[PDB]
Amino acid sequence: ALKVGFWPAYSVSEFPPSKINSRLFTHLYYAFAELNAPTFEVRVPPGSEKTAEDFTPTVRRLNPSVKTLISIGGGGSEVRDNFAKLNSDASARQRFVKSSIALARRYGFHGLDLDYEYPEPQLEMENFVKLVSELTAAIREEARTSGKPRLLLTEAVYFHQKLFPWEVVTEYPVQFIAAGLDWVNVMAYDFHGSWENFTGAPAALRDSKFTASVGIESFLAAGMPPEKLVLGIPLFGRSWLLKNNNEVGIGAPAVGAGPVDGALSFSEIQNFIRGGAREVFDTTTVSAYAYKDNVWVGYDNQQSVALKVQYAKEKRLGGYFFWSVNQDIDAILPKIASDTWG
């Protein structure tokens, strides 16, 4: 039963690792180490070496059984560009593989994660396959030479097995992934947001083609062992500005991004509700939304998280993950999730 949380280094001043309730997790990720083109000597951003080193001893103090991984990359164009450059260059791949393994050992992490959004089109998937195959082999070799248990290896994946479901250019090779990786973190969110002129459920479990269940179904149908899938749950919501204050449900017309630039942490959503916003549970999508005046936000709440976690158990999945733990400062949703699986 994998109970996974991502801690982003950007949040250190407001949410240091000491604030994570590690009792509610089995694995905690440090996000992110950088690719460091053109040498591809993978590293944490210079200046954050102390934070990276202290992360694992700190989180283990509250739950010694908890393990940690360091995630390399992240969302966004710069990371994607760097992976694409890296994966086409055999010498660069070698430097990346060696330095990433060294990095995990240097800071006392138990594993590595790759966050590459996304290995498409076909050429990019083919070259990513080369990188990951080489990384798997080197991880096994390092275990042999050091005598230590092999580093864990995971990666972030799109919600769906096909890239992309409306126009397939490539797809995740599930047998390859199951053999080389301990699990994948399924990013079952960002289905809807301010890029649309209507409100919607950003992480709908079901409904539409853009749902967590449809995505999970696609990986399983391709042949992914269910235990290799870890269901992502966001600790943030997507927000809109409403066109009309009297149209406040799902599918209401919108005029752009709400605060803050279209995303609001769960903790800020709790503040929003305490400040007069009305919370609504949407049973159709298994999600929540809240609104006040011209601001509308869709997110996961106590009820929808319990339902999603039970869904993951019903579907025989490896577990669940939260992005990102700094966004639920009181750990309300990680608590519900942990209690639900137990």
Ligand SMILES: CC(=O)N[C@@H]1[C@@H](O)[C@H](O[C@@H]2O[C@H](CO)[C@@H](O[C@@H]3O[C@H](CO)[C@@H](O)[C@H](O)[C@H]3NC(C)=O)[C@H](O)[C@H]2NC(C)=O)[C@@H](CO)O[C@H]1O
């Ligand atoms: C596994 C996963 O969920 N991956 C993707 C997420 O990483 C991504 O969340 C966003 O991550 C970036 C990088 O950590 C965040 O950007 C940072 O934001 C802070 C605060 O605003 C700012 O100080 C930093 O400068 C900025 N760093 C960078 C490198 O841009 C961003 O806040 C995260 N967004 C949310 C909503 O949590 C999500 C969403 O884009 O996508 C996942 O696929």
Ligand SMILES: CC(=O)N[C@@H]1[C@@H](O)[C@H](O[C@@H]2O[C@H](CO)[C@@H](O)[C@H](O)[C@H]2NC(C)=O)[C@@H](CO)O[C@H]1O
């Ligand atoms: C061809 C087309 O219109 N495709 C739409 C997708 O762009 C859209 O995907 C979403 O795009 C957002 C803006 O780039 C991203 O923030 C978000 O991650 C992404 N979500 C997914 C699941 O791919 C989808 C979903 O709204 O709709 C398609 O119609």
